[PDB]
Amino acid sequence: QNKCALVTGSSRGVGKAAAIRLAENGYNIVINYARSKKAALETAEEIEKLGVKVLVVKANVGQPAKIKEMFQQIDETFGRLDVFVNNAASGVLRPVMELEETHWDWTMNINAKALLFCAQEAAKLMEKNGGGHIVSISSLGSIRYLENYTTVGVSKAALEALTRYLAVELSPKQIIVNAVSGGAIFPNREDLLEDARQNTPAGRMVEIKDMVDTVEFLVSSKADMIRGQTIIVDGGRSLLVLEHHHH
Amino acid sequence: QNKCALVTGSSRGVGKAAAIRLAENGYNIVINYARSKKAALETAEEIEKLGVKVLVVKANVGQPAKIKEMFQQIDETFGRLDVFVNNAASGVLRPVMELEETHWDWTMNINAKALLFCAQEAAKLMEKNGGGHIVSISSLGSIRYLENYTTVGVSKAALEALTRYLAVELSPKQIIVNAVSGGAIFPNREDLLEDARQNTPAGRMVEIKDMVDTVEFLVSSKADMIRGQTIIVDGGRSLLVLEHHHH
Amino acid sequence: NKCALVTGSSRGVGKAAAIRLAENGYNIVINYARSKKAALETAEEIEKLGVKVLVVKANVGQPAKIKEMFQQIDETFGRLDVFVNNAASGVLRPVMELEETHWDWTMNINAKALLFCAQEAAKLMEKNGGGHIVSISSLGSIRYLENYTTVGVSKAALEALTRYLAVELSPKQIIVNAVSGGAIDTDALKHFPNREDLLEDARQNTPAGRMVEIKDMVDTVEFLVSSKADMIRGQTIIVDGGRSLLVLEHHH
Amino acid sequence: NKCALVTGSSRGVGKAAAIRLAENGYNIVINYARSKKAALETAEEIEKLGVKVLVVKANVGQPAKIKEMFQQIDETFGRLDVFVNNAASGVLRPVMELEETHWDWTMNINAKALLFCAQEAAKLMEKNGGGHIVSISSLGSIRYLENYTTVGVSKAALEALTRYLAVELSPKQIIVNAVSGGAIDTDALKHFPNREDLLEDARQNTPAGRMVEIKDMVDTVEFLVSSKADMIRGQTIIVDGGRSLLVLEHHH
Secondary structure, X not given: OOOEEEEOOOOOHHHHHHHHHHHOOOOEEEEEEOOOHXXXXXXXXXXXXXXXXXXXXXXXXXXXXXXXXXXXXXXXHOOOOOEEEEEEOOOOOEOOOHHHHOXXXXXXHHHHHHXXXXXXXXXXXXXXXXXXXXXXXXXXXXXXXXXXXXXXXXXXXXXXXXXXXXXXXXXXXXXXXXXXXXXXXXXXXXXHHHHHHHOOXXXXXXXXXXXXXXXXXXXXXXXXXXXXXXXXXXXXXXXXXXXXXXX | OOOEEEEOOOOOHHHHHHHHHHHOOOOEEEEEEOOOHHHHHHHHHHHHEOEOOEEEEEOOOOOHHHHHHHHHHHHHHOOOOOXXXXXXXOOOOEOOOHHHHOEHHHHHHHHHHHHXXXXXXXXXXXXXXXXXXXXXXXEOOXXXXXXXXXXXXXXXXXXXXXHHHHHHHHHHHOEEEEEEEEOOOOOOHHHHHHHHHHOOOOOOOOOXXXXXXXXXXXXXXXXXXXXXXXXXXXXXXHHHHHHHHHO | OOEEEEOOOOOHHHHHHHHHHHHOOOEEEEEEOOOXXXXXXXXXXXXXXXXXXXXXXXXXXXXXXXXXXXXXXXXXXXXXXXXXXXXXXXXXXXXXXXXXXXXXXXXXXXXXXXXXXXXXXXXXXXXXXXXXXXXXXXXXXXXXXXOEEEOOOOHHHHHHHHHHHHHHHHHHOEEEEEEOOOOOOOOOOOOOXXXXXXXXXXXXXXXXXXXXXXXXXXXXXXXXXXXXXXXXXXXXXXXXXXXXXXHHHXXX | OOEEEEOXXXXXXXXXXXXXXXXXXXXXXXXXXXXXXXXXXXXXXXXXXXXXXXXXXXXXXXXXXXXHHHHHHHHHOOOOOEEEXXXXXXXXXXXXXXXXXXXXXXXXXXXXXXXXXXXXXXXXHHOOOOEEEEEEEXXXXXXXXXXXXXXXXXXXXXXHHHHHHHHHHHHHOEEEEEEOOOOOOOOOXXXXXXXXXXXXXXXXXXXXXXXXOHHHHHHHHHHHHOHHHXXXXXXXXXXXXXXXXXXXXXXX
C-alpha cells in the first residue's frame, strides 16, 4: 500500500502545510516536532482524517542520536521512506553557540551541517526502498533573541552549495535532491506586517502555499529530471535592491 | 474568451510539444516557424483539432522588422498575449558571423541578445492586457556545420544573467520571467544515440516532455512567486564530471 | 596626486585599506561614522606618509550628508580615482521596523546603501575620466544590541549588485569589483567582554593556518585597484580561507 | 628552488605563464602536446633566465602518459609547488562520438581532464607540503576542423570543478583557484587565413580599451600564486573586460 513522507518541523507553519498537501496526495506522514506535543498531535489528527496513517516523533537539530532513533522508528513503523522534506523554514529556535557570535558564517555552517546530517540519515533508509526525493527548504525569518536562539535557516548560497553537493552524492542511489529558499512573513504584529506590505510591490507577497506548491511540483513525477537545483520563491523580494535602483 | 500563447520555433521539437501542451490547457496558440511551412501548417492543424484558435507566422532570429511585424499580427489577430515561450532550444540554425569565429563568447552574446530582443518586444504587447509570463528555454544541441550555421542556444550562465535582468525590468509591468536550460537528445543517428545511452546513468536521460512539464509548471498560477529563476532540467548531465570524479 | 575615498576608515579594514593606498601615493579621504578621535588619529598617521588627507563625517541612512561629502572631496581635491565602498566595517546602524520580519529586508537596505554610494561616487569620477570602485563586505559581529544591525551584505547580494554596477559603469571607464572575503573573524576588532575566549573558540574551529586577517582582504583590494587588474569587471572574490564552505569540508 | 608545471606551455598563455613564473625564480616544467621545436625554443628562453627547465610531452586523453610526466617531475626535481592547469591553450583534441549529441558532453570530457590532472598533481604536491593549483580556461577558437574540438571549459563547469577541488584539497594545504577570463580573443594566436580581418572585427565590436590580452590572464594567475592570495580558496575569476556580459551592456 501507501508511500511514506517525513516532514521536519511540521506541527505548524510551512512544515504543517507541506505535510497536509502530501497527505492529500496520499502519502503516510511522519510529523516531527521540537517541544509542543499539543500542536503536533492536533496536527496528526487532522492528517489522520484524510485516510493516511500518521506517526509523531519528537526531535530537534541539536540531537544526533534522537534523529537516528527517529529514522529507526520510521523503519519500524512503515519500513520505507519516499519523500523527505528537510525543513529549515520552520522558524524553530536553537541555542546560540559561542562560536557564532564571531561571524555569521559560523551560524550558516552549523545550520548547513544540520541540513546535511538529516538528509544523509534519511538517505540510508530511502535506499532500502529504491530511493526517493529530498527537498530542503529554508527561510531566514527573524533574529528576535540572540541570547541563544537563532534561526535554523541557511542562506541561499549555503543552500545552493549543500544541495548541489547532495545531488551528486545521492543521484547514484536514486534519490532526487532539490531545494527551495524564501519564506513567508510578538508585539506590533500588525504594524510590522503593514510595514512589510507597503514596502512590497502589490501582488508580490509570498505566502506559505507558494513554497508548498513548488515542493509539491518537485516531488511529483513531473520533475524527476530536475537535479540539485535551488529555487527561490519570494516574489523577487531578495532582488528588490535592484528593481528600486534600476527603477 | 481565451488566453493567448506565442511559442517560437514551434513547428517541431520542443516548441511543438510546448505549444501542444499549452493548447491542451486552453490557450489560443501562435505558431512561429523559420523556413518549413509544411511542418508548421501540419502542426497548426493538430492544434486546431482541440478547439483553440491558431495563427502561423514566419520569422527567424536574424529579422528584427519581421519580428515586430509578427507581434503586430498577434495584436491584430487576438489583441493580447499572456504566455510567451522564448524558445532557443529549437535547434534552428543561423548563419555564423565572422565575429564568432574569434571566441565562443561572441556566439553567446549574439544569441543572448536575440532572446532579450524577443522578450522585450513581447513585453510591449503583454503590458496592454495586464502582463503575463515569459519563459526562455535553451539547449546547446550540436555544432554540425559551422560554415554558417551555429546554434541559437545560450549557455546556462548567459541564460541566468539574461533572465535575472528581465525579471527586474519587467516585474514592474506584471510580467513573470523565468527560464529552463537543458535540451533532449544526420547519419550514425542510432550509433550516436547508443553512445549517449551508455554514457548516461540509467533512468536519467532527459526527454522533451521533461522540459515541457517545467515550463507548464512555471506558467500555471502555481508559480507566480518564482521570479528570475533559471532551472536546469537534464537529469544532472551537466554535472556528471563531478559524479564520476567524486565516485 | 590621485585621490581615494574609503568609508568607515577610522578603524579596522577601512583604516588598513586607507594606509595601503596612502602607501601607494594616493591622497586619502577618511570617512567616519562615530568617533572623531580615531579618525583624527588615522588622519595623522597617514599624513606622516606624505599625502594629504581629508576627514569627513557621514553614515549610511544620511543621503544628504553623503551627497555633501562627495561635494567636499570635489571642493578639497577636485577628483576621485578609487572608492573603497566599505560595508565590512562592523559599524552598527539603527534597525528599520520592517526588517524585523525577514533577513531579506536587511540585505535589501544594506545593498541599497552600497548601490547609492557607488552611484554618487561615480558622478564625481566622471569628471576625471572614471576610476575604480571596490565594494567590500563582512557579515561579522551580528552580535546583539536591540535596535542595531550590521551594514554588511551577503555574498549573493554583493555579487548581484556588483554585476549590476559593472554593467552600468564600465561604459564610463569605472572598473567595479567586490571582496566579500567574509572578512576578519579573528581580530580584537570585536567588543565582547569575553573577546579572548571567543578568538580561541574561532581558532579551535577553523583549520590551522586558515584564519583570515584584515591584511588578506586589503591585499585583494590593492590587487583589484593596481594596474594589473583592469580587465576584471563585475567580479566578487570571497577571501576567507574557505570558511564559508567548511560545512562541505566537514562532510567531505 | 621551487618548481612549477604549466601544461600547454610551448606557446600562448601557458608560455607566457611559464615565463612569468621563471621570472619569479621557479624551475619550470614545459608540457607540450604537438610541436617539439616550440617547446625547445621556450625551454631555451626560460633557461636564459637562470632556472632549470624540463620538457615533457603529453596530451589530454593520454592518462598513462600524464601519470608518467608527474613521475618525471619527481625524478628530475623531486617536488611540485605550482600547477597551472591549462585549458586555455587553444590545443585541439579528437572529438569523441557521443559529444556530437550535446555541448554538455564536451564540457564533461574537458572538465574531467582538468580534474584528473589536478588530482595527479596533488599526489605529488603532498610530498613537499602541498602548493597552488590554478586552472585556466578559454573557449577561444571553436573554429572548424571536423573531428576536432576545444579542450576548454565553460565558466559554470570551471566554477563547479574548482569549488570541488578546493574542498577536497585545502585540507592538504593545496590552494585551488581558477581563471576563466574567457581568455585572449585578440592575438595572432589564431590560424585563420583572414587572421587580420578577424582581429579588426573583434576590435570593432568591443568597447575601446577593453580588449583582454594574454598578460591580463597571466597577471591574475601570478597574483593567485603569490604570497598575497593564500586566503582565497575555490574562487573562479573571469578576466575578459566584461566581454561575456556585453549583451547586458548593449541592452543597458
